[PDB]
Amino acid sequence: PVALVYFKLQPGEQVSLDGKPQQVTAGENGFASLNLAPGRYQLEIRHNDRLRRQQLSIDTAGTWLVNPATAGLEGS
Amino acid sequence: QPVALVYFKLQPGEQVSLDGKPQQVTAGENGFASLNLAPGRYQLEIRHNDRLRRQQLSIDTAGTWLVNPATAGLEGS
Amino acid sequence: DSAPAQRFSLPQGCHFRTFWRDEANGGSLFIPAGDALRCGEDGWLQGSGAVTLQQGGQTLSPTLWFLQGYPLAQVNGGDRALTVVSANAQRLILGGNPQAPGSFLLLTFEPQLHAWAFNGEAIVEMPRVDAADETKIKQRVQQAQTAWQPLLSAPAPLTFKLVEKLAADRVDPASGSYLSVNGA
Amino acid sequence: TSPQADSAPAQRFSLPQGCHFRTFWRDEANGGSLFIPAGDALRCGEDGWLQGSGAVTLQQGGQTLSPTLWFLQGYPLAQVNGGDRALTVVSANAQRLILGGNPQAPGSFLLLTFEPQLHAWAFNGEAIVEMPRVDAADETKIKQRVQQAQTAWQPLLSAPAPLTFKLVEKLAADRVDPASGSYLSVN
């Protein structure tokens, strides 16, 4: 079983999965994708000190659309 | 008496109500309509066909509120 | 507003299209590859599928029906070939029903579903001159009911808005309606 | 390698007393809320745009955020506060806002990314320095320009910290990433 995961990315944002750098580029309308096998992955999207994070839990085949939230938001 | 401005998106055909009473307001620039409310607790409702969006408004301090009324009954979708 | 719907693909290669804005709210949408999903020769998703949406402490699991890649809620046309006359971030107009060609369904975009949902609004194009005959109104509306009722996932409240011409150029395509006939 | 920036302008909203602020607000039909108090530190400029610092309250999903925001020309800014200083908003869109017009370091800019949950632009450490590549061959020059930019922007930083400086020959304010083409990054 494999799944596609889509997320919004801006040029200059760095994507890591489980700490491992991923050379993905945003496409039509700033959307990027990863193809993942069943399992849990720590998605991190960094823009300088800005960190957006989401745990991806892949089990069945299909497509995920995700909007990782910003960690440590001012006001939290 | 009115101390706060409440903004929300209002499309043509949609009816806004406050505590059950329809309000005669029209979307100005940006597709946003505004109400001037005095201190108090109000139930904001936007209706169009069978779609109902609801927002509880707690007005106390002077200022401006931007609200996105929540659609009711999506669990039934 | 002026933004176009974004295209996304399933692993198999079929494409769907909807509005997804970055609200950095931790929200998620999962469309499982399912046995009821089909791909059109045009490469667009068709068929029905149970979707899982999660955001702000709420999970929703609606069965959506795809037409030309567009996710629709509260409507299931099975295999019926319909047409999306107009689609935008506010509303979608469903037409191309050969059984009632001058009738349309209006579906408003539901942000939490990332899909267009039917809330009872049907539009019937009829000359105002013809509407001077309650019998002719009843027959046009009976025809629209017969053509659209089978597609109502849950047979639901159906109101027919009579217009002289559909305004696909407007946010409210039934603006100018002169008569409303309740349905069933 | 950067696409062109979204052109949609910020939406204007008014406070009870007539002053205005500008941000991006989308209808997500999810019960979300933003409250801006007509606070004492918030004054109206002669342009009618809100200016000054204020605590805003945002609620969504049963969660509250209460950031202190600095309004510059009506725009809500987070992680930066220049009090009554006048700075240049070179560009502002739903993706990012470019701050310039710093008298102590012209040729330098701060990038502020739009934070959807705050309905405001937040500074996350990115500074851009316009400097020719030939000048960049001299480390004395790089050290001079970066130290001037750091000295000029650190007073506005809520939490004073080492900034990352992206050296560009020219700022691309028409692009989502205005530092597209940066040839070096000092940090």
TrEMBL record, chain B:
Protein name per UniProt: Serine/threonine protein kinase
Organism in which the protein naturally occurs: Serratia marcescens
Shown stretch of the complete protein: 409 to 481 of 481
